[PDB]
Each structure stands twice: as structure tokens, then as C-alpha cells.
Amino acid sequence: TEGIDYGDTMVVWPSTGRIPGGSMPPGWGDYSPQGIALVQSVLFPGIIRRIILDKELEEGDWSGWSVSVHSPWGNEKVSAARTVLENGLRGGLPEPSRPAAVSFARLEPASGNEQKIIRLMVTQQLEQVTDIPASQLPAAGNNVPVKYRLTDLMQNGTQYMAIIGGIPMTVPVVDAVPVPDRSRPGTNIKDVYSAPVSPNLPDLVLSVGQMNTPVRSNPEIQEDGVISETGNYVEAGYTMSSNNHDVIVRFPEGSGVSPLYISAVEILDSNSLSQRQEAENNAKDDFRVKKEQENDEKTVLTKTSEVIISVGDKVGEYLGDKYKALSREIAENINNFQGKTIRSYDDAMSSINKLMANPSLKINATDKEAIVNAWKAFNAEDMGNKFAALGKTFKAADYAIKANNIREKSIEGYQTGNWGPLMLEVESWVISGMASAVALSLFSLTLGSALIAFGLSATVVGFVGVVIAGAIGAFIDDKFVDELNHKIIK
């Protein structure tokens, strides 16, 4: 499964394939008639094991997979990686809203020369990966909330196995089913269950019978191609290999067998590593780019909102409170305008033509002269620099140029009554590639933060409070330019 999890911010790397790359029927060898393949290895929690599909098919055995589940025993490396993960998590995540990882084993690349489908499996008791009682686990085929996960880490083209954690993660609950005894029909094999640890591969057989037997076979358990090394609080990977999975295997009805978390990884070969490292490198930088894009968009929209409300307040204690209410609306609309598109050129210019058509919306030559001269002294260059003496508002002073055009073009329009150069320059910004929301902010910010700073009389501050409100209005909605004419100017 995959579910609601959404890979806890991870994109899929469609796996290399599964190497294979360089007598019948099953049962004939010296094996048990029960039907299950030999019990090839023991699954102690935290200790990684190299498990082979059809380990001994040709040697005579039955089809598949079979491992033994055992209680805590021996030297495992997860508990040390968990300690570094927990400690580092007290100092915040590497990257917010993305899990944190610490390696517990390093992997030597597969030769590619293999016929067998190998799989590295790691095991953990329920409680070590989650605080939900066994007794409160979901019904199989649903994801259970987890706190730790055991998966892999592509770190510098070499594949690692790590413990992730830190954000709200989730894991699929799957179902262990009793396996039938092919030698004694009607009855099932005692204390042997099968579960879809999978993926694409046949169900793993779990022999849970002799879970507590004496194990006096050296606490190390050194696998070939699995170097056990602890290492450092890093950010987790961005791609999940298609053939890798971790699930919580839930045992039957009255089995008396507590849920096991199991992780099944695919050892990637030398050219598949490079494949995955660029998949990684690319998923990382694109996330990085989307992140700043949206954050910086959010900050110029919140500062615009605030400036549009201040304009509302200043023009408001002269033009009225019906004017203040409209500014709440334009600022509300801008503060949510993320992802939206400004209105068209022909639609906006029909709106401001409607405003400027209102005959009780006039200025005398002395007031007109004051607005023009106020724009002539405007410091376009510092309005450009604002992403520094405001906060982190826009990016790169290529904006000083745009801010100077709004200026020269607001001057015309007050001078000629032609707002075409002004409205057209704003569209230019979008067309040559600016996000509508960012183009709305710069326009609204340049107009608003110039008005709350102009040395102008109240008659004039009212006229410009109407012009710039009808102008920011027109790129958002025609509602805004009807409220002005019909309820405010009159």
C-alpha cells in the first residue's frame, strides 16, 4: 500500500527492475511436505538480514520465502541511531514538514549479476515504532499512525538503511493468515502464518513458533554487503524505490502473536544508485524551489494586505467607514489571492473606465499638480529594495525598474487620464513570467505605500484613495469598482 501517507513527502523512484540479470515440480528435495519453503533465517528485532526468494528451489525445495520471528536477542544498531534521532529532534527538523533520519547500516552495492531476488529485512516490535496499543490497531488494509520507521537513505550515491521520524508518519496494517499443511490436509501448519510483506513478491512465511528458544550463536550476525555503522542527524530521502515496503503484520484471531513491524528493502546496484541519486538531487532542488516561491509569495501578499488596510484606515477617517470596509475586502482578496490569476487587461480597463467615467470623480489643476509632483519625488529605487527594510518582500532589484514605471505611468493618467500604460505594465509583468499574486502585491504596495507617505491634503488623499482602490480593485473584481461609484463617491 501507499495510502493517505503520501510517502511523508516522498516521490516515487520506479525501481531499476529486480535483478535477475547475470527439473520440476517443487517439493522433490529433502524438505518437509507441509508445503512451505525452508526456514532460511531468523528475524531478531533491529538486526538486518539478507533474505533470498526461492533460496533452494533448484536444490529441490518448495516455492518461496520463510523466516523465523524471534524475541529480543543480540547486538542491534537501531537503538543507537534512534538515540541520535531523538536527540537531534529536540533541535528541530533539518527540513520542516519532512522527516528526519539517522543511518544504522551502510550498504555495499549489489553486483547486478544475480538471478535471485534478495531482500534485506528488518524487524521491530509494535511498541518500538508506535504508541497505539496492539489491541487498538486498525483492521488490515488501513494505515496505522507511527512514530519511527525503518527505511533506506540515499546518501551521496551510496545507499544507507536509516530510522526516520519527526513528522506525522503512517504505516499499512496487513494480515497474517495461517498456512495449510500440505502433508496433513484440513489442518493448517501450527504456528506458521503468511503475510504480504511483498511488494510484487510472494507472501513471506513467518514461523513464530520458537520465538523464545535459546540462541547461542554469537550476538553479532554480520551480513555480507551490510556494514553496520551509526551516523549523524540528516534530512530524510525524497524518493521511495518502488520495490521497497514496510508494514505492520497483524497475526490471527487468537494466535497470541503480537504485531510485528517489518521492513523489506532492495539492495540497489552501481548504476541504479546514480539513477536514484539524480532522482534524489532533482526531487530535492524542486522542493527547494517550490518552497521559497510560495513562502516569498505569502510574505508579499501579507505585507500588501496590511498596507491596503492602512490605506483603508487613512483614507477612511476622511471618506468614511464604507470605504474602510471595502479595503478589508481588497486586502482579504489579496491575502488569499495565492494561486489565483489577476483579471484580464480588457476586463480591468473596462472597470477603471467605469470609475473614471463617474463625473463626481474629478480633481482641480492645483490638486492634480500635487499628486503628479508627489510621484516625481517618489524613490522608486527604495520601493525596489523593499524585501529588506520591510522584511523579505519580493526578490532582486529588477523591481526598482518596475516601481519606476508605475510611477511615470501613474503620473500620466493623472496628467492625461490615460491609465492604459499603467494597467498594461502590470499585465506585462505577468506575461513575461511573474506570478499574478506577486504582480498584484508590487502594484498594490507601490500604490498604497506611496499614498500613506505622500505629503498631500485631505481632498487629494481622498481622490488618490479612490483611484488606487478602483485600480487594485479592477485586477481582482468588478465588485470593488461598483462599491466605489455607487456607494462611496456618489
Curated annotation (Swiss-Prot):
<keyword id="KW-0798">TonB box</keyword>
<feature type="transmembrane region" description="Helical">
    <location>
        <begin position="456"/>
        <end position="476"/>
    </location>
</feature>
<dbReference type="InterPro" id="IPR000293">
    <property type="entry name" value="Channel_colicin_C"/>
</dbReference>
<keyword id="KW-0472">Membrane</keyword>
<comment type="function">
    <text>Colicins are polypeptide toxins produced by and active against E.coli and closely related bacteria.</text>
</comment>
<keyword id="KW-1003">Cell membrane</keyword>
<keyword id="KW-0078">Bacteriocin</keyword>
<keyword id="KW-0614">Plasmid</keyword>
<keyword id="KW-0044">Antibiotic</keyword>
<feature type="short sequence motif" description="TonB box">
    <location>
        <begin position="8"/>
        <end position="15"/>
    </location>
</feature>
<dbReference type="InterPro" id="IPR016128">
    <property type="entry name" value="Pyosin/cloacin_T_dom"/>
</dbReference>
<comment type="function">
    <text>This colicin is a channel-forming colicin. This class of transmembrane toxins depolarize the cytoplasmic membrane, leading to dissipation of cellular energy.</text>
</comment>
<keyword id="KW-0929">Antimicrobial</keyword>
<dbReference type="GO" id="GO:0005886">
    <property type="term" value="C:plasma membrane"/>
</dbReference>
<keyword id="KW-0812">Transmembrane</keyword>
<keyword id="KW-1133">Transmembrane helix</keyword>
<dbReference type="GO" id="GO:0140911">
    <property type="term" value="F:pore-forming activity"/>
</dbReference>
<dbReference type="Pfam" id="PF01024">
    <property type="entry name" value="Colicin"/>
</dbReference>
<dbReference type="GO" id="GO:0031640">
    <property type="term" value="P:killing of cells of another organism"/>
</dbReference>
<feature type="transmembrane region" description="Helical">
    <location>
        <begin position="434"/>
        <end position="454"/>
    </location>
</feature>
<protein>
    <recommendedName>
        <fullName>Colicin-B</fullName>
    </recommendedName>
</protein>
<dbReference type="InterPro" id="IPR038283">
    <property type="entry name" value="Channel_colicin_C_sf"/>
</dbReference>
<dbReference type="Pfam" id="PF03515">
    <property type="entry name" value="Cloacin"/>
</dbReference>
<dbReference type="InterPro" id="IPR036302">
    <property type="entry name" value="Pyosin/cloacin_T_dom_sf"/>
</dbReference>
<dbReference type="GO" id="GO:0050829">
    <property type="term" value="P:defense response to Gram-negative bacterium"/>
</dbReference>
<comment type="similarity">
    <text>Belongs to the channel forming colicin family.</text>
</comment>
